[PDB]
Design a protein around this ligand. Structure first.
Ligand SMILES: CO[C@@H]1O[C@@H](C)[C@@H](O)[C@@H](O)[C@@H]1O
Ligand SMILES: CO[C@@H]1O[C@@H](C)[C@@H](O)[C@@H](O)[C@@H]1O
Ligand SMILES: CO[C@@H]1O[C@@H](C)[C@@H](O)[C@@H](O)[C@@H]1O
Ligand SMILES: CO[C@@H]1O[C@@H](C)[C@@H](O)[C@@H](O)[C@@H]1O
Ligand SMILES: CO[C@@H]1O[C@@H](C)[C@@H](O)[C@@H](O)[C@@H]1O
Ligand SMILES: CO[C@@H]1O[C@@H](C)[C@@H](O)[C@@H](O)[C@@H]1O
Ligand SMILES: CO[C@@H]1O[C@@H](C)[C@@H](O)[C@@H](O)[C@@H]1O
Ligand SMILES: CO[C@@H]1O[C@@H](C)[C@@H](O)[C@@H](O)[C@@H]1O
Ligand SMILES: CO[C@@H]1O[C@@H](C)[C@@H](O)[C@@H](O)[C@@H]1O
Ligand SMILES: CO[C@@H]1O[C@@H](C)[C@@H](O)[C@@H](O)[C@@H]1O
Lengths: 313, 313
């Protein structure tokens, strides 16, 4: 066994690095702490133990994360909710983990809400712009709400009418250009868009099983967008945009059918042009991922460590 | 969500009572504590919360339990293992829960061992006789070992050659008459027997999926024996002895196929003539049971409460 909480949410980030791409993945342990595992290049994953705690949250808290590089080092923000269902944030400030300012705002989250986050613009010569997406209510038809950091936290938009506790994918497809994916009450995944000065309904839609976990990434100049969804113990789906949307397809391995456990979640990261990881939870209880390689395709990669309880090896 | 640890082992007991049969079920929470839930007659289940802790054990500890009535009240013994893989015992002494004497003996248990226990003879006019079954080693071909209480703890028999971490069912089919069920290295469930002065190989056998969780009960004068086995997310099987063994059959509900989660465990209790519960773990994460009623048959009964984490209703 491991210390990975069954039906923990997952969050993941990636960035380019001299010597190999850096990845971090966040998950919850049996004690409610949020742990980090790390990967550099194709070296074995590290971390995931009781010595890798970065924060804590209510048991079964939703999670989301973003990163950028600043003059102070690598910045990471991990979003979660506390035991009072208040939206909360852990900060890696370039050198240490601390509690961030978002928790003091008092944003109430529905108990079954998921979280998504995106960021654009942050660098060693420009400030970050963060957007966090959440729900206030658990019921069918609830909207998605946005909290905004472009110098200070303030409320943003609300939109959509969703399945209860919908999955939410969020990606900045270009500077100040946002795409948000969620599952509407007809079980179709839908898209909401911001290009300049307003939100509008996007052209993407796809039928999916009720209650799928959703993630989204993007890169490049077209731009390229990939939207992932998965119901636990069903195969992963991807929809791809390269100027138009393709027909969604399954990412699967005939020797390892439907490798996730029931009622589990996914997360995706990306960096470069292009490296992609899609994390899932499997028997073990293990943290697994799909990986994309151009000219090999998709495969299940190395297992991410998630601790070993006392009394076991 | 609940506080029921996913892939927790389960133990259960039952006894006849004026006003309705009493049941207790034991399971592990996310903190490693062993909790109790209670039922009287067909009234709703109670307990299962953080206020119902009876002991603690290593995370994912095996569990077993027995009960009898004494001059001091209802006696319960719950077997588990600590963080050093030492066989341990919690005692309900008729009025309170305390730590029992078995832990001080120093019986090492294989980290992946299951536990079973049986009892006969204990009453308000006779002392109890307890037997606890465990494994020392995790590997294929390991034996089952027995620890014995008939006034003080001492080692008993060892027998069998099993699948790694085999399920173990144990029942006293009559006074000092024992039947032990386990899965041998050919994946057949096999039977070991004690009637008077020696162990011998029994006539029961049945093919089963590798790694099934096993439970066994018995009652009456024939006697009647029932052996249960289940692999997580497969249907429950029962083999029945009433003088001869029947062909094993599935206990299932066409509207709720394979209702347990992968890699989960079962436990059975019985009392009277006859009331039977077979507990399993399902999405929720929930503690469920099959129940037998003469002239209705088998059905899935009321859900057993297993707590609600803070931040959820
Ligand atoms: C150098 O430190 C490593 O990388 C940082 C960006 C953080 O992810 C930190 O938790 C990790 O230990
Ligand atoms: C400087 O403040 C830190 O970084 C900002 C970009 C926000 O993530 C804020 O909540 C956090 O406390
Ligand atoms: C300028 O407007 C703010 O930033 C945009 C990119 C959107 O996140 C919008 O909902 C928010 O109010
Ligand atoms: C112009 O079209 C809009 O932007 C594209 C990048 C896609 O997100 C598409 O689904 C959306 O309707
Ligand atoms: C070139 O292939 C396309 O882009 C890759 C980065 C993957 O998203 C793949 O599933 C998709 O078909
Ligand atoms: C009266 O007390 C109830 O029954 C006893 C036999 C024990 O199961 C105890 O934990 C429970 O609360
Ligand atoms: C009196 O001693 C108690 O009851 C016996 C029957 C045993 O269960 C023993 O380990 C326990 O401490
Ligand atoms: C008398 O022998 C003891 O009791 C029997 C009923 C068996 O449990 C045996 O293995 C044990 O040594
Ligand atoms: C006499 O036969 C023995 O006892 C019966 C009660 C059964 O346990 C049977 O499988 C075993 O071989
Ligand atoms: C009378 O029916 C037999 O005994 C019952 C108590 C159950 O064990 C049932 O599955 C079995 O077929």
């Amino acid at each position: 066994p491991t210390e990975f909480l069954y039906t923990s949410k997952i969050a993941a980030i990636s960035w380019a690095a001299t010597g190999g791409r850096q990845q971090r993945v966040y998950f919850q342990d049996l004690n409610g702490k949020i742990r980090e595992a790390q990967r550099g290049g194709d070296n074995p994953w590290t971390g995931g133990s009781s010595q890798n705690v970065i924060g804590e949250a209510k048991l079964f808290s939703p999670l989301a994360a973003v990163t950028w590089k600043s003059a102070q080092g690598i910045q990471i923000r991990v979003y979660c909710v506390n035991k009072d269902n208040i939206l909360s944030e852990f900060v890696y400030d370039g050198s240490k983990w601390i509690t961030g300012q978002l928790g003091s705002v008092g944003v109430k989250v529905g108990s079954n809400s998921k979280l998504a986050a995106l960021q654009w613009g942050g660098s060693e010569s420009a400030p970050p712009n963060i957007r966090v997406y959440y729900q206030k209510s658990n019921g069918s038809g609830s909207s998605i709400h946005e909290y905004v950091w472009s110098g200070k936290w303030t409320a943003g938009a609300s939109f959509g009418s969703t399945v209860p506790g919908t999955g939410i994918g969020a990606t900045a497809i270009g500077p100040g250009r946002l795409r948000i994916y969620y599952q509407a009450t007809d079980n179709k995944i839908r898209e909401h868009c911001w290009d300049s000065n307003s939100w509008y309904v996007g052209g993407f839609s796809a039928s999916a099983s009720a209650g799928v976990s959703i993630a989204a990434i993007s890169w490049g100049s077209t731009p390229q967008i990939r939207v992932y969804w998965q119901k636990g113990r069903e195969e992963l789906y991807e929809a791809a945009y390269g100027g138009s949307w393709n027909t969604p397809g399954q990412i699967k391995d005939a020797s390892r059918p439907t490798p996730s456990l029931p009622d589990t979640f996914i997360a995706a990261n990306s960096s470069g042009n292009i490296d992609i990881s899609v994390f899932f939870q499997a028997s073990g209880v293990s943290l697994q991922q799909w990986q994309w390689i151009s000219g090999k395709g998709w495969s299940i990669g190395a297992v991410v460590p998630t601790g070993t309880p006392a009394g076991w090896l």
